[PDB]
């Protein structure tokens, strides 16, 4: 399964992984907003939005 | 702005804040001292100390910082940092710790006529005597004195502050209702302000702010009075139990152990001042002595109950008096029961009268309407 | 006119306090320091911190601050404030808080030949692990480590002071103006220069001067308030064997009330023992043992009551008498052995076990 | 030395500590950050604060503080104070109530090539996530996060000098053991700004609480009272000591609850093993009281059935006490 | 390094004065926008009513003097200057127990070519905030941090709120910013509402240091787990034993012992809870109300079983009749009083347990002040 | 004032604050140091420290700070900040954990003749000498030693301003009463230095604790427990009630031991009077436990036969089932002797320091 | 009888009292060696050397 592993608005970058899920994690801190991308989709602290997905390259 | 910079450069060309302003040699600078009490933090009596957060109003006329606003783009007042302008050393004198000077150095406000204003906030920890003889049902005077540490009455003349619209002086600690939090255990009844001199020292003068505050004892009332009332009820009940149950000492000494437990509870929260005994400690000791006498009299009752003709012979005086008051062993239990009922009535009278007298003495303690200040 | 003004203005002119006073390269400033303890303020085992008031003196040489006494009206000693001169940054490294430096920055006494005599008083919250094995009958071996904070062994040479030609390898104590802490007595007080051979000549941690303080606690407050009350109260569990085993004999309440009093003493000792989890305190071991003894007392009372109220009462009394001696002997030998072990714990008569010297004037 | 005086004078004639020491403002100042653990002052579970004594090793190159040793008598190292040069403002991103930056000056070593070696001490009070679930047999993995407060990655970059902190001079805590300790450098990018990295270093220490103080202070008496309370059932009901022994061991357990509640941390994040075992003992005692009151009621209502009930209850409560003290 | 030339031109060549506020004429106002990032909530221990918390208060103001042309120099887009060289508007926390009014670390500022200065100094603040113990330990505390500008009046500087952008529109930051990833929840306190408000007091005049205010409220609800495990459950169980003491026969004269010992355990629990609360007399704590109710009930238990014991041991100078009278009155008293205790405890502890915060701060304001749904 | 500004500018032009004010280096600065006890903040015995709020008043003449009042318009007193002139460094030698020197500046008063009038405040945490032997009826005599740190007698000489410390504005402590306060000055010479005196001024205050808090919170419950523990012997053995009374009064006394050790200072220099009394009461209660146990064992003896015991216990009754009678006689004998022991011990433990 | 009342290395001075013994109390402090002389001799703290002498002019 191929999905983006970049962070925030970097140039796109992909990685191979055995999980059937790929997530986009977005949250805001005292400076700005952070977008985190990777495989699977684990539990997150309250106040963070997550985008569990199943197809290839869907966490853009 | 550029004009403000020009005015600041002109004013501070030859001005040093280590020289007292004086038109003529020997002149006095009239300093107005005021106080706004933001909140009364704590008045813990273990260390005999009161902590307050206050704004200390100051107002003195400095002739060197005056100008013509018509020549400076119509600017009437400036905000100059307090370290760039002379200020009197108006400090707290009766402070428990070593902090004399104001905590926060806000910049001063100077008008074009030379008038200078200062409202520096401070966390003042002042020491004040605690009249612990009606504790906790007490009110504390707990004064707070302000004066210039270095300048005396021959160089400065302290005065009372002025209200917002300034025609008449204010002689009391004013409170901003927008920024004020009640302590929750103290209520500010009187808050006068008065200048003090000393006849022995003609070179002395201060401005003093008092706080006649009366404690709210609900916490102490509940947490000590109510269990003490229950302990007194147990101690008065232990007589009504029959001697044959053989369990009077269990109840009596359990009540005494409980009252010692509340002594342990309260020993932390009572001040360690030896001037006088507070009401609450006197009440605790009264209850403890009452329980001790209950134990002693119940031991007497048990001893009279278990006496037998084979060991004790009835004297004539107890027979007539205890079989007089009601208006061979069976006589022993009868005398035991009569003595028990007499002790029950006697301790009812003693406990009720003592408790009512103590609470009436501690309830007629009210701060005077005139704080004599 | 005070000519000391002329000397100060001449010496401090073109004098930089950020410069090592080395004349050239390969010149090492020999710093001689001796410690004079004034008060042993406290030692709290909860924080594992030792508080003392000490007057450390530091001596060293500065070639830039020497003059000719003949041309300056014959004066040879001048006092210069410490903030205007270069100072060797000797600090107490093993401190619980961040107070590395001295408390009072006293004036520095300069001499004709550029010698220095700085005696700044200081209060140090030094750290030392607590050996709780023999508490409260314990002796603590607390240290005070002094090393230069910035300069290494190639720039300064820390060493002990030399008085009358012999190095003062001890913490100086004023015999007539010193009072005991009241809980701790000072037995040994050696001082030795130490090297960290695991670390090279550089890196500022090679050399150090260590001032030891072997102190033994005075166990008078603990005995009369914790130890003796505990042993006296729990000596009462052997009296359950003389009470009758019937209704009103009333053994179980005595045993359980002595146990609850021991629990109250466990609360009382909870505020005194430290939080170190390396060894069980000796008094803690005794408390656990004596509660176990009370446990045997309670169980034995239970079986005695069961037998005397079933079987027959006389066999119950025989069991009672037989086990009374066992319980009394057990309690006596346990308490005697524990308190003998506590008492026999004494400070070693050598400050360093392998070093034959006494390290005392 | 007069030569070193000439160094200190010449190097600081036109030196601004306000301005970072880089040849061109586009470039970045590279800093190698290192941590040297010394001791653990304390670990506060209720306040979730870990206080430690550390010295922060910082190395970086200054281009404006170069000199030729041959021109100045051959010296190659000086000891300028901190307040005379530029300083990276390394701060704790998870400070609880300590000092964010470093408040100790501790004059820094300066090589002739411009390299600067600064090792100031600090008392880091890092906010620590305390997990009270296996207390006291618990493991702590709370860290300290370091980073440049005002400069970003493309201006001032910090790199760890070693993959793990320095514990060559560590002093044993007495109640904590370091299983592992490492250091990681994090790259974080913001949506505002695709090419502005922000760098930080987190030094995480694994800590094992030594379970001896709480075991001999809190665990032994819980088991002690628990084994007591099941023993009351073997007493004959004829002796009037059944309720006395049972309620008195309950009262001793109450005083023990008092000492525990003043001893163990008061944090309410989760119930620990201490809390679970205290609850188990308390429930055991309460059930013992209730059922043995029923036993006395059976006696004074029957003696044989009361005795056999007492033996059965004794066996059952021995069994459940053993399984409860083994499971927890 | 063009930074040297830029700093020298800005601060020294132009004669920058840090003691004069940055206005063109002395009639304009300086717009100062504030935020507050709560790094962590340290504690709110109730003895001193202190709210100690590490916060990251963020400033943003315009300084026309700290401007330059980027193209004239090298393309220097961001500049950094220590606070002691630039005009820093000192706002202070008006309510604090200790004497710390300013921020902890006076960190470096960031100034842009247009003069936009941003300052984010970390600070540890120990504010004074009252505590209502009425529903302890199930209570929620609503106490705040109050920030005021005591150096300049509202006629000179204005303390606004930070405004950000999502879709090209500006909306004020009306809440305390919490970093969801970095923030670890406190072990005793749970943050429910974090509203931020700018306060203007019409009572006073603009030419005064106490006309404007920015308040960062914090409504936090305690986690009732420690107290329901070490204070509620054992007390309830021993109260249940006190109630059950009536089911003990009077033949064994040992009921007084059980009742009085339960009362003494109640006294021990009172000792324990007396050091967990401030000496506040506004209202009785729920623990206090429950404890005094249960101790009064246990005293009634003691008195009533004493009546039973006295009735049992009566003599004509037949005894089975007195024994049955005692048993009957004991059963009647149990049936009367045990439901009273059970219902009272249940009612008290469900009344305390039903104390969720009103889910809407500033009751006369429909806005929930939540970061999920901004205003503009 | 412009005149005062000109005067301040003139005085502080060539002035140097790091040189003592003497015309010739052989001279010494004459300083008159005096104290003003304002309050006695606290006296903790466990750390053996006394802390008080004072302000030490010292006077000296600075020759190079003089001026002619007629030249400057007539000003005679000026108020230079203390940070810019020469200051003697008086250091509390027995400082425990406070400040060796002062930290407050509190600008001084300067006279036209050069005299300097400087009264800065300071909280002295002076080390104390605590003797806990008659506590709480204890009198303390710990001192407050001051002297110049870096200078000696021949360079900076200090003398007391008044023979006694100034206590005109000393507020009452509330738990201490002061008998005597006194000020002494000592010269010490060293085997070095045959003509180099070293000077100091030692102020000692005789402090007596006000014994009312400890008497009515720590002693009266001890009296009650001591009276009650010996009264169990009046309670007949027939009721299984001696044991509960005696062990429960012991347990209550143990709780009172908890509170007393929470209150009493934890110093271990010597056993205090309160500690001696509580140890006596512990021993008394324990002895009552053993005596009650042996009495109970006597009561429930039953046929072994009763021996001379009946010869003396059935002559003792003549000067005021058989096992119960002898137990009763023994109980009354022990009650009498235990009341006597309790009262004589209570009188004797506090006999002295009260008579 | 007559002893010496001088201290350390001061010029010799003599005094008379009712005690028939002298003493020379010598101890070391942080600045030098102190010698205290008079008549009689009391108990002293450890670390101090005494020369309790019964003859006349013997505490020199
Ligand atoms: C209170 O506590 C203190 C410390 O906490 C106790 O003081 C300790 O006393 C011990 C007993 O004397 C000391 O052990 C002795 O240490 C010395 C010195 O050890 C150092 O040097 C060793 C040798 O280094 C040379 O050789 C190496 C190999 O060739 C070379 O590589 C190197 O460059 C050197 O040339 C080194 O191996 C070691 O690691 C040290 O750095 C030894 O010579 C003795 O053999 C030790 N044993 C004895 C019996 O003397 C111990 O050093 C000392 N600690 C400290 C910190 O000084 C004190 O005794 C306690 N008081 C009590 C218990 O009453
Ligand atoms: C609170 O204390 C102040 C002074 O400590 C009291 O003020 C004195 O009042 C009396 C009676 O009018 C005057 O004779 C004194 O001159 C006042 N000053 C002093 C210094 O004693 C004040 O009366 C006290 N308040 C109350 C309510 O008792
Ligand atoms: C939390 O406390 C704040 C301040 O104490 C409350 O805000 C004020 O509440 C009062 C009471 O009705 C109103 O009159 C004011 O208009 C409110 N605002 C200000 C600025 O004072 C707030 O309502 C409280 N919230 C909760 C949920 O208790
Ligand atoms: C502030 O403005 C009011 C409005 O008229 C005025 O009455 C008052 O005098 C002003 N205060 C100052 C200090 O200028």
Numbering used by the authors:
A (entry chain F), G (entry chain G): 1 to 60
B (entry chain B): 1 to 323, 325 to 328, 424 to 469
C (entry chain E): 1 to 310, 439 to 489
D (entry chain D): 1 to 301, 399 to 425
E (entry chain C): 2 to 318, 442 to 500
F (entry chain A): 1 to 303, 306 to 309, 311 to 317, 319 to 324, 397 to 431
Task: Recite the paper's sentences.
α-neurotoxins are peptide toxins that are abundantly present in the venom of elapid snakes and that competitively inhibit the nicotinic acetylcholine receptor (nAChR) to abolish normal neurotransmission thus leading to paralysis and subsequent respiratory failure. α-neurotoxins are high-affinity competitive inhibitors of the postsynaptic muscle-type nAChR, located at the neuromuscular junction. Short-chain α-neurotoxins are composed of 60–62 residues and are connected by four intramolecular disulfide bridges. Each subunit consists of an ECD, formed by a short N-terminal α-helix and ten β-strands, a transmembrane domain (TMD), composed of four transmembrane α-helices and an intracellular domain (ICD).
Here, we determine the cryo-EM structure of the muscle-type Torpedo receptor in complex with ScNtx, a recombinant short-chain α-neurotoxin. The dataset allowed us to obtain a 3D reconstruction with an overall resolution of 3.15 Å and a local resolution better than 2.5 Å for the extracellular domain (ECD), including two bound toxins. The overall architecture is consistent with previously determined structures of the Torpedo nAChR and consists of five subunits, αγ-γ-αδ-δ-β. Similar to the receptor in complex with α-(α-Bgtx)14, two ScNtx molecules are bound at the neurotransmitter binding sites located at the αγ-γ interface and the αδ-δ interface where they are stabilized by interactions with both the principal α (+) and complementary γ/δ (−) subunit. ScNtx is pinched between loop C on the principal subunit and a unique hairpin in loop F on the complementary subunit, thereby blocking access to the neurotransmitter binding site. Whereas the position of the conserved arginine residue at the tip of finger II (R31 in ScNtx, R36 in α-Bgtx) is similar in both toxins, a clear tilt of ScNtx is observed towards the complementary side. This results in the bottom part of loop F being tightly grasped between finger II and III of ScNtx. Interestingly, the side chain of R31 of ScNtx (equivalent to R36 in α-Bgtx) adopts a different rotamer conformation precluding the formation of a cation-π sandwich. Instead, R31 forms two H-bonds with αY190 in loop C. This αY190 adopts a key role in accommodating both ScNtx and α-Bgtx at the principal side. In contrast, nine different residues from ScNtx form 22 VdW interactions, one H-bond (between δE182 and K45) and three salt bridges (two between δD165 and R28 and one between δE182 and K25) with the same six receptor residues. This observation illustrates how the tilting motion of ScNtx toward the complementary side results in a much broader network of interactions.
